[PDB]
Write a protein that binds this ligand. Structure first.
Ligand SMILES: C[C@@H]1O[C@H](O)[C@@H](O)[C@H](O)[C@@H]1O
Ligand SMILES: C[C@@H]1O[C@H](O)[C@@H](O)[C@H](O)[C@@H]1O
Ligand SMILES: C[C@@H]1O[C@H](O)[C@@H](O)[C@H](O)[C@@H]1O
Ligand SMILES: C[C@@H]1O[C@H](O)[C@@H](O)[C@H](O)[C@@H]1O
Ligand SMILES: [Ca+2]
Ligand SMILES: [Ca+2]
Ligand SMILES: [Ca+2]
Ligand SMILES: [Ca+2]
Ligand SMILES: [Ca+2]
Ligand SMILES: [Ca+2]
Ligand SMILES: [Ca+2]
Ligand SMILES: [Ca+2]
Lengths: 114, 114, 114, 114
């Protein structure tokens, strides 16, 4: 099934933050309304943040996360969780190798902000 | 119901990160086996990542998140989600007022690391 | 924080299913647009399905789950999770006693159907 | 990533319930420690419960859900959610066609019981 794609409310601000846990340099692309809106790049084997930014969900609200290492796409796992019918988390895990810990690049999208 | 309490696998390293979205200064305490192991604080209405740290769950694996503003405990909401039976996220939201956005202090705990 | 309240897309069919795990008789009331649409009453310590129906979220899309035992409201815990940005589950747990297992009456709402 | 596989606590009773939403007859196989423990077969386009039962996770605690239609394995999506650090839901969606509603066979596993 498709992973890393989330429908957020339209024209709404959201936070996107990426953490790295791999020997490989992670490249996290965030697409909004089918256009690259942000790109984070970094390396860490200790969960360091490699990027955090506030973006706008665009006209459709479609937000997609893609992760690659040196141009090679990582396999993704994702889900959205809503607490007290109002607080949203769009979560993404990614695997750049074969140990399947899926934490090589961990991406957290949260809204609302402010 | 109790919120902000999570049982992690024993003696496991995990990351804990806090975000702020409020006019009030947030203070986040992370307890391991009932004793504070990390504290973050900051003031942002733009999702600033006010703190992050790597901790060890210890023999009990018990982790609890508490959020306060000016010495007043915020109301918490939380849940744990596991992706592909391996990637874990312990999520916490908090409300320091009455506008019910529950994002005043958002905390994300993730494991495994590395 | 408020629990057991979910905002579903309007005029959408959804399933609601209740399970019982307690010595006490569980009364599960499902409100759609603030009006009772279904009620299940049963006792089991072995997860019997005390009720399962298909309801329409109506014009409001507001769905609320209430659980009581002999007229006394149970404390609720809830969350919504979305898989592959399309499959939705609204989850509810409830506690009627002191052991805090929150499974005394478990309710699962799922959509879309068909 | 692999989907439909969950690690439950050892020797623990859990509930498994399957719903159908497809023109095709769904065959849901529930494996415990890599051995078939239960099978639900049925057809419905109205979320009918095609099976509900109580199983034991055994020593390994390994539980896997497989879904097929006409012998063809459906594509699965899954996640585990834990509320108030006590109530567990292992959720599975499956797609037997191309409309990607992933509700063709919906499986809900919950524990603890009692
Ligand atoms: C150190 C190793 O680097 C990799 O690329 C990762 O796939 C492994 O999970 C691990 O983090
Ligand atoms: C600016 C406001 O600050 C308050 O303290 C928060 O409770 C509100 O949600 C909002 O962030
Ligand atoms: C048998 C007991 O019944 C009580 O009413 C419940 O609160 C307990 O969790 C347990 O199920
Ligand atoms: C009636 C249709 O049956 C197909 O086989 C399913 O894939 C569709 O989602 C739909 O339920
Ligand atoms: Ca890896
Ligand atoms: Ca890794
Ligand atoms: Ca607030
Ligand atoms: Ca706020
Ligand atoms: Ca109880
Ligand atoms: Ca119980
Ligand atoms: Ca389908
Ligand atoms: Ca279907």
């Amino acid at each position: 099934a498709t992973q890393g794609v989330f429908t957020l409310p339209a024209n709404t601000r959201f936070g996107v933050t990426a953490f790295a846990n791999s020997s490989g340099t992670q490249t996290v692309n965030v697409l909004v309304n089918n256009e690259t809106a942000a790109t984070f790049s970094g390396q860490s084997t200790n969960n360091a943040v490699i990027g955090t930014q506030v973006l706008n969900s665009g006209s459709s609200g479609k937000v997609q996360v893609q992760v690659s290492v040196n141009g090679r796409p990582s396999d993704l796992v994702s889900a959205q969780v809503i607490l007290t019918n109002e607080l949203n988390f769009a979560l993404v895990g990614s695997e750049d190798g074969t140990d399947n810990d899926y934490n090589d690049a961990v991406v957290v999208i949260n809204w609302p902000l402010g």
